[PDB]
Amino acid sequence: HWGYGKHNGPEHWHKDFPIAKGERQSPVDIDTHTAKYDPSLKPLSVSYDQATSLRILNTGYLFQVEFDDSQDKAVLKGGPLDGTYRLKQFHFHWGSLDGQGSEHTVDKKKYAAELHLVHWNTKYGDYGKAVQQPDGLAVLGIFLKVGSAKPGLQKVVDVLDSIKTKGKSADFTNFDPRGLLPESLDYWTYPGSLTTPPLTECVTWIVLKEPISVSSEQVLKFRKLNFNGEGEPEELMVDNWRPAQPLKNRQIKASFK
């Protein structure tokens, strides 16, 4: 199956998923000197006050926290978006070393990790339909740099030992994703794709300019997760990022400066 290694990593995905070589693939390098300030973009509206987390899961590629999206409890709107996108899950990508791990880059800079908050367009009724549409998902991406701890991340870090291996889940209720956001909602946006197979070009990306700070100890705990299942040889879950893909004809817009 696909993964992150020499024999099944990003460079191989195109054989199963030919859209890997498509015209709107993600992630990309954000060239902050060619991005265009768009005074017509709106402010983001990030409304997570009623978010209901359910569970945390090691998928064998990353870990994710899932939400109850069967009512409008937590939604993203405004900015570049038409309509209302409902929060379904968040997850992270991270590196083996503090100098890599993000999927997007900024003027070629790599961050230690990247948080993705995945939302689906409510015009399509559910996530599975949405993922099949050109404007089905909106993913809010937030960079992580190593420095001071992020207190709102610690509940996530402390449950990771209970989901060490592929396919393990744990209850994860009452988690507030507002504690993962930076102060500023300034962002870049562009049209792209899922960053893992099936690589569908269904995503409006909204990448915040301001990183969050997490401690060295917080990210080290991410790196103690395993790609393998229990009872299989241990393979540390690190470097689960796709490198930047060609921008092609796209424009990245900035909400600021």
Ligand X SMILES: NS(=O)(=O)c1c(F)c(F)c(S(=O)(=O)CCO)c(NCc2ccccc2)c1F
Query: HSE-up of 115 (CA within 13 Å, CB side)?
Result: 25
Q: Which of 51, 106, 194, 214 binds ligand X (CB under 6 A)?
A: 194
Site string for Zn ion, 95-124 (x = CB under 5 A): ---------------------x--------
Considering only residues 101-120, where is the footprint of ligand X by CB under 6 A?
116, 118
b or e along 215-226 (b: 16 or more beta carbons within 10 Å of the residue's beta carbon)?
beebbebbbebb
91 belongs to an annotated ligand binding site: yes
For Zn ion, the closer of residues 44 and 140 by Cβ is 140
Considering only residues 46-75, where is the footprint of ligand X by CB under 6 A?
59, 61-62, 64
d(Cα 140, Cα 143) in Å, to the nearest integer?
10
For ligand X, the closer of residues 185 and 199 by Cβ is 199
Q: Contact region for ligand X (CB under 6 A) — 6-14, 48-56, 75-83, 192-200?
A: 192-200
SS3 104: coil
Quickly list H helices, the chain. 127-130, 154-159, 216-222
- Contact partner at residue 75 from ligand X, Zn ion, none, CB < 5 to 8 Å by partner kind: none
Give the pairing of strands 63-67 and 75-78.
Answer: unpaired
196 belongs to an annotated ligand binding site: yes
- Contact between 88 and 69 under an 8 Å Cβ cutoff? The reply is yes
Question: Smallest gap, in angstroms, from Cβ of residue 26 to Zn ion?
Answer: 9
Burial of 14 (0-12, 13-18, 19+ CB in 10 A): middle
| Binding interface with Zn ion (CB under 5 A) | 116
Which residues sit in the known binding site for substrate? Answer: 195-196
Given the rule CB under 6 A, which residues bind ligand X? 59, 61-62, 64, 88-89, 116, 118, 127, 139, 194-196
